[PDB]
């Protein structure tokens, strides 16, 4: 279910208006552009993050995110 | 001053450490948990250096006792090493302000900063792991080597002895969770990422501290303090501010909420402009 | 006798 | 009467603008997207969120928030 | 011709897409979006916010906001 | 060269939403919407404010404002 | 091959919407404006960050990387 967890500390804004996510060695691909403040806020924030998807197959994009205090 | 660090076992660690803090730092009177406290180095002209020999290390006899670490006061950043048994001295190449007359000083072309020190050992700074007979060829092999450089096997030598030194008087959990690697079983340690970070982030946590006065809920970027045990393991000693502490931001906490956040970590996510014009379409 | 904090 | 209120635990983000919140134990979503980024505010702060509603039954649509601390 | 001056503990987004800032025990409304990013800043950093209206009676909104350090 | 670099108090935000800073003894009104929050989150925090222009009076063209770390 | 890296030791802006930063010797200037909280953000904590361009030998960037170390 839960395709990661963790802490974010890298990730790639590329030219074509995406990003991609960095964790537990397993980068997930979006062209979501409204989560970007969130993400750095919680990279920045020591917030935890975990990515949970349907399908979280090799480098799986990333739509569907959580936050945690631990 | 001279100094001398004894690893022969956890309590004489702990004790020259706690010396080494308390003939530096001045325990602070806002924390001050009777005997337990933590301290503010105590101001220093500049330039200033103490010197610490390793010691311990061999414990079943007198040997491998010919290293010092030169350490300057002013930021408690590691300045030099000396090989008494060729009574040469070594200086980082960004420590060449820093030098210690009447000893052989060579130049030696890798500086102290922490990026240079990963990418030569190449390895990532948590997870390492450190134990007796690794350190006493860490050791050998400086004693050794020599040169205007520090090899990949010297690169895990420097980084290992620098882990025991910097990390370990900054902050209370190495001590605590070093002490027991002296132990009968001798536990190899493992830099976890929360120390990685603790580490990462000492200068902005030793300004937000002074200010401190017994609070509960401190937040400064990655670092989080929830119970007063946490705050009182965390970090045993602070740079100075006079007035070099003062560098980004007028006032780095802000105590709202009975919480201590940092100013940066607030105003870094706190910078939303109109992002909904997008959303409205052609 | 160095408790649990050290 | 008063049916959710406390530290948000769990926030949830899905791609049909709608964002879950767990507050009390209990899942309340928001589809009006304009609220999704202002929740951050109270996320990091531990600004505890309450929330009003005729009824305690929850997974209808929230938009009346309140931030407090304890 | 302030009509109210202080700090702001709480902070409502009535249904109608209208804001509602309380300040010094009293509350006025407004429905400029812009305020929602940057206000929101004032509630979690002590910063000193003063109103002026044209009519400062009892439920009128406000248009104009000064923000001061103090 | 440069008119005012000092810390920023504060601006004016009539209805019109005029963005009328002042540093420094010195007013300056700019239409921008996009600096608000990078303006205030300068202020909240302390940070500089440096402004140049060929007229330094009040009222006069500005083309350069910029926040200086050192 | 970077274009740049490091910290905002010091920038700069202008009214015709374009942000640079002085970093690495260089005043590396971008006109796009949909970043600008990320970078401001990252210098507000001194947060390491680096940034690329078309190319990496007085123009615009729009490709950022952003590390915590």
Not at chain 2, 35 to 58: E, K, Q, W
Request: aromatic share 10%; charged share 20%; glycine share 6%.
């Amino acid at each position: 279910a839960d395709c990661a967890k963790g802490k974010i500390e890298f990730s790639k804004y590329n030219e074509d208006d995406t990003f991609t996510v960095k964790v537990d060695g397993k980068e997930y691909w979006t062209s979501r552009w409204n989560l970007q403040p969130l993400l750095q806020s919680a990279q920045l924030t020591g917030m935890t993050v975990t990515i949970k998807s349907s399908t979280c197959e090799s480098g799986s994009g990333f739509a569907e995110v959580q936050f945690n205090n631990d | 001053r001279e100094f001398t660090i004894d690893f022969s076992t956890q309590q004489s660690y702990v004790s020259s450490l706690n010396s080494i803090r308390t003939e530096i730092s001045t325990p602070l009177e806002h924390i001050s948990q009777g005997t337990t406290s933590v301290s503010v180095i105590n101001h220093t002209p500049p330039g200033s250096y103490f010197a610490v020999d390793i010691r311990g290390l061999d414990v079943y006899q007198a040997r491998f006792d010919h290293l010092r670490l030169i350490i300057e006061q002013n930021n408690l950043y590691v300045a030099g090493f000396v090989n008494t048994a060729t009574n040469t001295f070594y200086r980082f190449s960004d420590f060449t302000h820093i030098s210690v007359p009447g000893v052989t000083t060579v130049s030696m072309t890798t500086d102290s900063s922490y990026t240079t020190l990963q990418r030569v050992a190449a390895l990532e700074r948590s997870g390492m792991q450190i134990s007796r007979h690794s350190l006493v060829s860490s050791y050998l092999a400086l004693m050794e080597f020599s040169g205007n450089t520090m090899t990949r096997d010297a690169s895990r030598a420097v980084l290992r002895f620098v882990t025991v030194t910097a990390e370990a008087l900054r902050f209370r959990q190495i001590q605590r969770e070093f002490r027991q690697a002296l132990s009968e079983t001798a536990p190899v340690y493992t830099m976890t990422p929360g120390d990685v970070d603790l580490t990462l982030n000492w200068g902005r946590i030793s300004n937000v501290l002074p200010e401190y006065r017994g609070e509960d809920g401190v937040r400064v970027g990655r670092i989080s303090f929830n119970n007063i045990s946490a705050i009182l393991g965390t970090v045993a000693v602070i740079l100075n501010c006079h007035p070099e502490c003062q560098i980004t931001g007028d006032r780095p906490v802000i105590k709202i909420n009975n919480t201590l956040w940092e100013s940066n970590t607030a105003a870094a996510f706190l910078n939303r402009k109109s992002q909904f014009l997008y959303t409205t379409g052609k | 006798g160095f408790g649990l904090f050290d």
